[PDB]
């Protein structure tokens, strides 16, 4: 009944710095391990000074030396503090094959140190990127090996997705095409998070034009604390991750949900507002709070899972269930009859010390499905197609053995995958 | 993880001499050998340039190559020369005549193994080799001759390391020699096929930059190079120091090089302003991106607005905010989309370091690649054709005896070199 | 009295462009042991036909909820029908590919036509076997039927002796190992494991003029310095070419241990002289640049080591820069960048140059190696529109 974290790449390591800070805030945990009364991400020492069940992967020495010399360094154990010699330097080819074969036998060894400790392991999550070569290559190697090692667990991926307008490196579409096709081959569930619409939340819900990668991920980190950390706790109708396998995803490969978070309240907006149930349920169906550049009106709704926080009465929700069914402009699918899975737990979300959001009595992490992402799938693909036409930036990965037959493979079957979102509302 | 430095030439030895003056200022460094910094990042990532033994000294990873005594004598006689140790100064007592056909060919050959062993003295003692930094000339012979012969050997020693060099483009405006279009054109024959990259810095713009855009009086070699020395140190900051978007030099080698022959680049410094203009200016993210578009702040004498940008690196220094950073970068992309290339959608690569250099609170480093950097080549190549018709002063090199089959081919190198920007220019 | 007699203009830049030959992997002591039992036969997906020279691979077409590669087929069809000039298979013998490709060219290059032969395909496929081959089971192998080297060397003492003219056999073997140039026809006394003297005078020797000599008389023609031609009066002296084949760098990989690691440019020069009936001596010089290539190693599939990594990548970089020539030739771009790879500077002579050449497509037969063949079918489909202009060679008085 436990769960593991994995931090791959410069993106995925920095995600957990706010996530585990919230997880220390889940139980009042100081940098020693002080907590009363819980084992999901936790092993326990003799002193009761609990340790995370996390995996640190850095081919640089750089990013972990921020962590294991800064704060919260005593909670992480040098069992977990697994760094490397040299980065792939945004190379999918070196992150997968060349530099990836160097530290992989140490990290898999730490799994047998820790997955042996798990009393009935539920699964794990993987934190990585789509653009960085550590977060793309090492993800492509490890997830295939974990399918060999644990083919009967949960393979979650909370994967940052690049904007088709705001990008930081050139080969970011050139990375994720080769990455995700082998990821669709193996992974259980993969998310997409775009900082494009997170900036839209920073300016229209947070109303602040000055973000850091902390506050761009504390928003993401507050989701994951509501995704899984509440599932050990008991509310009205508690859910676990096994109630999403054939349930959330009605097919073997449709496993790409869309996560929203409705109450995003700057601290002054506690008084031009009076929160209720039906307000934030309507706030879940804004195209301006999708957290990814997408518009659900042009797509459909195959599923909609309402995962709640705090003081929630279901009879009040049954109004808000029946509300948006009546207030729809959604073009609901033909194949799902009505299935809108209800998740109501007890705990309100927690206030980040030094954060931006306000103390709300209730919070929704809504997982939905659409073909609006199938457009936003193809938008980064059109960035990828023009580089292959000129055959630019091609000498870095052929020199580590990545063939052009992969690019007719990975792109065209990703383009074939985008055609399979269209196959939702065809036969009726 | 460690970066090796080589210096050559009457300029590049002094250009490098100004550079470690900056790096000593970077970390709180005594000339004698004691630590006087206070930042932990000065102390935590020592190993990128530095070497340690016993003796309470600062002992360099600096191998310095010359054939003149009095150049590096005056380096040693001046300050930041006693910051070296005399286990490094490998040189000869023979005038090269400022000739490419001697330092590459005859007189440098008497000094090859006395340098490459000292390379092996360092590279075998290095923990993790990552950088082979070279600083030299392309106008004289010690910089051009002795520079190219090392790259024929160190790449043979290390085929899988990073070969960067800071090669000074000659200026048609201000010079004293005559055979200046020989030291460049013949160095091109080796810098293309054996270096992973090189920069293209010309004094011809630098006389305009310090005088006009910085409001100074006389462009001095102590300050024309001081402008270069800050842009030298700005390259590998995210390698050295922590950043949100830590970009490797190999990442900089990946994303700025779509084709492995177009590895010619141009630096750019973002607060290029005078002294009195501080009280007439606030310093912002649009203020730093303002000089991305400026033609005069291009340190090579090239109009960026003539050609079109191939790739652009934005290397930032300071506590910034990304939505301000990314959108202002996006605003410039929306402003001058005609000055870019189409098949690269993300025309500008960002790179954010978390610490600005001291004295500044916001700083950045423009590193662009445009289709008008080829212009400085067409100055020297047509000169090189004019030197070939009369074969004027060929009686300094005919005794050396470098072939015409070399010299037709260095132009044939140059003809294929320039004209392929213009495939993808328009 | 008079009608119009309308006329049309011409283009003499050349229509004799290129030959594209597809001889693939096949008949071995080991390969039909495993391909035909268990998997479908000699062209399982591919459907070999030789007359129209068409071939069309597939995979199993099923309703995939994420549609895989090669699900482009229909109710009953063949797809990606890459027809070529002549496609050959396992039954193509050494004399058969001689009879169609090599032999009738070897009577056309006797008068001054020039050629360049190279192969292209996936690693471990038979690039070495097509070029080098092996001498057959004879008590005396009197230049027996083998790869394209000794069988043309059999023709070398045949048709230059059938001409009964003043000929001069000239052969120079140059390695291309990590884009360097190494002779193996040399004395190689520094190469072999020998003991230098106690007073060492030459422990290293840079001597060969290994630099390109651009003459710019025509365009594309390659000149190097200090080449060592081979003058043999019979086929017994061909064992020093076997010494070059012996000392050529090979690799022991998981994909293939018989795969050669490096590759070589081995030129031919049949310096044949005879006087014409006008009173004019005719320097008939044919050139047959017998260039073997190494394998496009899937380095993740072989699982190579660190010393094998920079070897396999630069082989892959050589084949990648080769493909950088192919798209530039067919789009007709102005400054085709030969100058990155020196092998492409060696391929200035026929890729965009003047004289003839051919391409060999030794590609794999396995079902897991079909999209690997597509990276070769990427450039084999592009291989046709390569502009050339052949010419003979003579001597003026
Ligand atoms: C009153 C005062 O202190 O003023 C500043 C200053 O205002 C200005 C004018 C400085 C000044 O620099 C110059 O005038 C200059 C001229 C030629 C070549 C190089 C510099 C300054 O010298 C430069 C210097 O800048 C730095 O210290 C940077 O960190 C810089 N460091 C050095 O160049 C340096 C070298 C040796 C010893 C001490 C400093 C740097 C920047 C990037 C990467 C590495 C280093 C400082 C504080 C100033 C003065 C003194 C006027 C400027 O330059 C730099 C490089 O910061 C010119 O454009 C900026 C704008 C600055 O505002
Ligand atoms: N939202 C968010 N995105 C990030 C963050 N850090 C990196 N990214 C994204 O990740 C991409 C690059 O991936 P990185 O994780 O930085 O690089 P990597 O995975 O370590 O692999 P390398 O490129 O070799 O360093 C960038 O384009 C960003 O879009 C972060 O802190 N927050
Ligand atoms: N068409 C064919 N006819 C006969 N034998 C073949 C044929 N194709 C493959 N073989 C056999 O398959 C073996 C394996 O091929 P091999 O030459 O070792 O690899 P490769 O493709 O040449 N690699 P490389 O040497 O790196 O270029 C050869 O030695 C032949 O014995
Ligand atoms: N910026 C700068 N350029 C210099 C300096 N000294 C020489 N140069 C330039 O260097 C070039 C000549 O090369 P040089 O290094 O002097 O000769 P070498 O020793 O034979 O390489 C010319 O373009 C000069 O303008 C100097 O101190 N500063
Ligand atoms: Mg990384
Ligand atoms: Mg073979």
Numbering used by the authors:
A (entry chain A): 2 to 38, 49 to 439
B (entry chain B): 2 to 44, 47 to 360, 369 to 437
C (entry chain K): 61 to 457
The authors write:
Like BimC from A. nidulans and Cut7 from S. pombe, U. maydis kinesin-5 has a 72 residue N-terminal extension. Both constructs bound the MT lattice in the presence of the non-hydrolysable ATP analogue AMPPNP, allowing us to calculate their 3D structures. Although the density observed depends on the overall resolution of the reconstruction and the display threshold used, little interpretable density is visible in the N+UmKin5 reconstruction beyond the N-terminus of the motor domain itself, i.e. our structures do not provide any structural information about the U. maydis kinesin-5 N-terminal extension. The ATP-like conformations of the motor in the presence or absence of this N-terminus are very similar, suggesting this region is structurally disordered and does not directly influence the motor ATPase.
As is seen for kinesin-5 in other fungi, Ustilago maydis kinesin-5 localizes to mitotic spindles and contributes to spindle elongation at the start of anaphase. To begin to understand whether Ustilago maydis kinesin-5 is a possible target for novel and specific fungicides, we determined the structures of two different motor domain constructs of this fungal kinesin – with and without its fungal-specific N-terminal extension - bound to MTs using cryo-electron microscopy (cryo-EM).
